[PDB]
Amino acid sequence: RSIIAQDMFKTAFKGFKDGISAKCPKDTRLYSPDIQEDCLSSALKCTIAELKVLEVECNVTENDDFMMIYEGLNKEKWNTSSSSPRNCTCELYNQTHVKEFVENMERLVQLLYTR
Amino acid sequence: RSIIAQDMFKTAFKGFKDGISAKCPKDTRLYSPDIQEDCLSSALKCTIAELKVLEVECNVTENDDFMMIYEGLNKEKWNTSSSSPRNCTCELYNQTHVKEFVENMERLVQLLYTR
């Protein structure tokens, strides 16, 4: 369990989830993938893909926190594997407000560091 | 599609969704299933279990809409079929607040009638 990377996520997630809402239109919504055992890989690609939809919806085209989060996801090698993997579809997830989106996102990264 | 049933679910989801939040602790969080094609039957069993959870923690008595939604979920025979049906765990879904829980519950019920 890579405590150095996990702490960089933790702080980047706290220093973003607490500022956000205020940094996005109240009516912004995003598809929030969850942690179903067999859809980890999909759930990762959609999380990254809605980050982009959040990059034009709000400021965050800059932001130390946003860049660390985004860059971490595309470059860290994850164990997203299972015995019965499945292709989820991003638009089949629940849409949510921007703050809950990063919370779930924090939950998806904690899980994949646990395995 | 049975227009009679979709119409009652429409009235029942509007009256139930309006009183809630204020009828529940803000601290209440419920698992909220999505509409992924291969887990609809799981998604329905989890929506039903958590409605029960919403029961015991909320001041929802005796809601005509609630026990319509609930008993409707258990008796209606939905097409929960797909090329590759799978099992999904309730607790691997996202939690959210009550407002979005029924909102997502509605969306799921609509999907089921759409097919």
UniProtKB/TrEMBL annotation, chains A, B:
Keywords: Signal. Disulfide bonds join 24-58, 39-88, 46-90. Coiled coil: none annotated. The keyword Metal-binding does not apply. This is Interleukin-2. It comes from Ctenopharyngodon idella (Grass carp).
